[PDB]
Design an enzyme around this catalytic site. Structure first.
Site, PDB file in Angstrom:
ATOM      1  N   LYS B 111       0.971  -0.836   0.033  1.00 55.21           N
ATOM      2  CA  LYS B 111      -0.246  -0.218   0.239  1.00 55.21           C
ATOM      3  C   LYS B 111       0.477   1.106   0.076  1.00 55.21           C
ATOM      4  O   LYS B 111       1.859   1.244   1.331  1.00 55.21           O
ATOM      5  CB  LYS B 111      -0.915  -0.127   1.129  1.00 55.21           C
ATOM      6  N   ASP B 198     -18.526   1.409   9.621  1.00 58.13           N
ATOM      7  CA  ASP B 198     -18.661   0.977   8.749  1.00 58.13           C
ATOM      8  C   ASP B 198     -17.963  -0.120   8.986  1.00 58.13           C
ATOM      9  O   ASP B 198     -17.165  -0.997   8.666  1.00 58.13           O
ATOM     10  CB  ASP B 198     -17.446   1.558   7.154  1.00 58.13           C
TER      11      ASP B 198
END
Lengths: 64, 271, 114, 139, 37
Positions: B111, B198
């Site tokens: 990432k 979430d």
RNA sequence: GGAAGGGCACCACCAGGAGUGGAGCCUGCGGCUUAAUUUGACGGGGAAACUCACCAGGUCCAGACACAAUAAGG
RNA sequence: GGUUUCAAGCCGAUGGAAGUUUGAGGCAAUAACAGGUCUGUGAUGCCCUUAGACGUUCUGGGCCGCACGCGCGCUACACUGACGGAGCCAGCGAGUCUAACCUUGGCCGAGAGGUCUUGGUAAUCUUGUGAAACUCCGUCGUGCUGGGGAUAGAGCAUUGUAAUUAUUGCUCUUCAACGAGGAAUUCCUAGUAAGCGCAAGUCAUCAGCUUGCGUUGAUUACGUCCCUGCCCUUUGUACACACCGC
């Protein structure tokens, strides 16, 4: 073409000192498509250099 | 070793001032002649690893996103990490996710963070460090989560996990224990002091080991949404987590709860 | 059977009677025309069929015309169909009638992911 | 004049390799010359394609037909420099017998002066054939 | 197919005039489609 | 100078409307694969032939003039 | 009539077809573009001068292949809806020659389509392009249903030399995920959005590609620089490069 393909890690130097690296053999006759530093003319030499390890050699007496 | 060391030196020639002129990259390197410094800077600029800012009577050198990660690769050459680079699975907002491999040959996840001159780099650095510390906190508490390898100043390299999201998962056989799991895990979140708002279908990742032993786990990736219980709005955040689990299990798995689900007032006697 | 017809009765049929037993694609293919060169290719094909030993497989004939309807004239021949790179030799069966020659020669390597 | 340059090439091969010296003179002077001047004249860069060049190459096999049909009224109709380079490479590449090359040089030296005619005379002086003395006197 | 100056890039293939959008705006002041609004 | 102040914008925000990202599929890029998945960052790049710029092959046609031989029974 | 040194001007209202510069785009002079070639000319420099295909062909496969990622679109998750009938409302275009364009009408076929002609080189014929969305009446009855139409089978026709990895159109059948959608993302103030289809270029056949056209026609601002940025400036300044620990 396998000459171009298997030898990719060895860098391209132009005889005018411009570095580069191959993409692939554009032709099957080993005509290859390469990216260089600059606007070369057709007169320079795209080149590679390969090195063999050399070793010293013996000696003997010499009585005249 | 040497060229990477001098590139580390001009990396260390960034934490001195603002936008760095030419003779500072000449002298911080401390190299021999005009040759090495100037031809190195030209190799940077032609590979877009550096840029020229010419503000009046003042040459300066502007580092973009390109000519950093090599040093991170050098930083990850130090820490036994990745050798081969590039397979695109997921271009996120605050990171770009790639599939990479080490010298050992195991695929990993790279990432890179892109969040110029100092602040893009430095805020990507703060984001990577913050996410690495949050991953460390989750693994230290014992949450089932991917194991971090390293956080190469602004690029996080971690493991790959064989999972697929729950939107393509029809059901399992042990549905009420899965509901008790996805209730008790949000209970464990409230017992940590946090609420992951979430908690959707795309978050929850299931690894699948076998069909007889049933020794599997979960992966929860909700990092810019976890909110402490002391904040203003955590009540219906917790309730949205619980009720998204319940409405998914009613819609997809066709399961209604026989035990009543936990409230925030239920979990106020937790942590 | 191609239309419920015995095999040897199919074998001695002309092209046009096989068009009389054909689907719409084959009928409208033959109704527009055919090139003069596959007639000489069929003469070479039947000459190589005449170069066949008894109770064995005939001489394989290599083919480029992949769009040709397999008519029952060519049942039994060993045909090397050209896929763009190489020839693949298949015995023509009565199960292969009404088909193009391109349907029986894979033109590319398969793609292996998992 | 509505053919393709492949068609003009093949028809020039046919109508020079079969027709005689006066007949291919009429062929090249009527069909090849007008199509030639209309390919180069009506174009905005005033150049020629490669297959009309090959047609003018193949038209030189009978040299009487070539010089009496192609070159001699063209310079009297206005010859420019792409015609000079193309038909001079024509005039250079094909082996021509020395008599009609000599008559061609005797033609081209008499012309109103133009650097195209200079290119054609330069090509005919690249031959160094056994010239008759009248062709030498025209020089 | 460009039949004028071998300029396939951006043919205007409508109505068979077949000029590229580079040379179409070269020859734009010969046909009559000009700037009004 | 990492001071502050105005524009003035729905490629900005508020009032909202239609939405995308959710399902399937069409289509462009990247990646993989290959013998080639031609090549750019919509390329008028709509598409079996052409266009085709890429592969598996099979082929023509090269090269002027000079100059040593060779000749019309060849 | 407010506002403005009561100045060049701005704003609210009335009359006005039109009162925000009634709104948009092209046009120079001065100061940047090696921006892209001309198949340019010059005893230009220079690797070869050609057994190279650079030129030509001719076949057959590609450019479409698939664990996946980035994105735009089409179609749905229905009862302000699907089906079965009826009514039948536009406009921009566009159309054939030394060719087969747009086609009216009549017969055949379930249709696809086919046959026979006819009109129009065009405000004339196609054309009043009887488009779609829409209006009304019946069937359905909330049930992955009579919503959906992905996938697949069978044949039949059309253009193309060639339709196979199906070009496409027609008939019946097979009826998948999908119960208003996350992190995040785009565009927008009146006939505009949104929904709808049609026409023109891509067009040998088809669009889910692009552009114009017309039909029905919302909600809600007419405020802001709070986010996003973009600038425009004001000037505290260069420590005019200083010490160090390192």
């Amino acid at each position: 073409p396998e000459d171009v393909e298997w030898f990719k890690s060895i860098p391209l130097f132009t005889k005018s000192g411009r570095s580069g690296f191959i993409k692939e053999s554009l032709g099957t006759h080993g005509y290859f498509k390469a990216t260089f530093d600059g606007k070369l003319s057709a007169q320079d030499v795209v080149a590679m250099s390969l090195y063999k390890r050399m070793w010293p050699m013996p000696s003997l007496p010499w009585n005249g | 070793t040497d060229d990477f060391r001098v590139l580390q030196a001009v990396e260390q020639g960034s934490r001195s001032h603002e936008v760095v002129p030419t003779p500072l990259i000449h002298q911080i390197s401390g190299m021999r002649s005009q040759s090495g410094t100037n031809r190195a800077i030209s190799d940077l600029a032609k590979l877009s690893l550096i840029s020229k800012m010419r503000n009046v009577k003042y040459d300066g050198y502007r580092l973009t996103y390109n000519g950093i990660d090599y040093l991170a690769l050098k930083t990850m050459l130090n820490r036994d990490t990745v050798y081969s680079v590039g397979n695109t699975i997921g271009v996120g907002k605050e990171s770009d996710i790639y599939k990479v491999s080490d010298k050992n040959g195991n695929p990993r996840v790279m990432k890179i963070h892109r969040l110029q001159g100092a602040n893009w780099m430095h805020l990507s650095r703060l984001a990577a460090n913050k996410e690495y510390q949050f991953m460390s906190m989750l693994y230290s508490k014992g949450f089932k989560v991917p194991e971090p390898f390293d956080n190469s100043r602004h690029i996080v390299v971690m493991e790959l996990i064989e999972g697929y999201p729950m939107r393509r998962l029809r059901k399992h056989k042990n549905i009420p224990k899965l509901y008790s799991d996805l209730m008790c895990f949000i209970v464990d979140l409230a017992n940590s002091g946090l609420i992951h708002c979430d908690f959707n279908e795309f978050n929850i990742m299931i690894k699948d080991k076998l069909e007889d032993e049933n020794d599997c786990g979960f992966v929860v990736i909700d990092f810019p949404q976890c909110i402490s219980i002391q904040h203003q709005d955590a009540d219906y955040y917790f309730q949205r987590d619980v009720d998204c689990i319940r409405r998914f299990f009613k819609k997809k798995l066709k399961y209604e709860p026989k035990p009543d689900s936990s409230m925030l007032d239920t979990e106020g006697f937790g942590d | 059977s191609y239309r419920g017809v015995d095999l040897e009765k199919l074998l001695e049929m002309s092209t046009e009677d096989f068009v009389k037993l054909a689907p719409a694609r084959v009928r409208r293919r033959f109704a527009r025309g055919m090139t003069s060169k596959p007639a000489g290719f069929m003469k070479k094909l039947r000459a190589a069929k005449l170069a066949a030993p008894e109770n064995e497989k005939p001489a394989p004939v290599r083919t480029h015309m992949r769009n040709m309807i397999i008519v029952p004239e060519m049942i039994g021949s060993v045909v090397g169909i050209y896929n763009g790179k190489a020839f693949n030799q298949v015995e023509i069966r009565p199960e292969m009638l009404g088909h193009y020659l391109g349907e029986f020669s894979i033109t590319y390597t398969p793609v292996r992911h998992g | 004049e509505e053919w393709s340059p492949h068609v003009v090439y093949e028809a020039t091969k046919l109508f020079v390799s079969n027709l005689t010296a006066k007949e291919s003179q009429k062929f090249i002077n009527l069909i090849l010359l007008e199509r030639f001047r209309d390919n180069i004249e009506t174009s905005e860069d005033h150049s020629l394609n490669y297959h009309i060049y090959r047609a003018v190459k193949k038209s030189l096999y009978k040299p009487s037909a070539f010089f009496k049909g192609f070159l001699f009224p063209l310079v009297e109709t206005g010859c420019n420099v792409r015609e000079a380079t193309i038909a001079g490479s024509v005039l250079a590449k094909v082996s021509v017998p020395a008599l009609h090359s000599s008559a061609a040089l005797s033609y081209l030296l008499r012309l109103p002066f133009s650097p195209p005619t200079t290119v054609f005379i330069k090509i005919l002086l690249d031959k160094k054939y056994a010239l008759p003395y009248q062709t030498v006197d025209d020089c | 197919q460009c039949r004028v100056c071998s300029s396939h890039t951006g043919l205007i293939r409508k109505y068979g005039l077949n000029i590229c959008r580079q040379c179409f705006r070269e020859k734009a002041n010969d046909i009559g489609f000009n700037k009004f609004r």
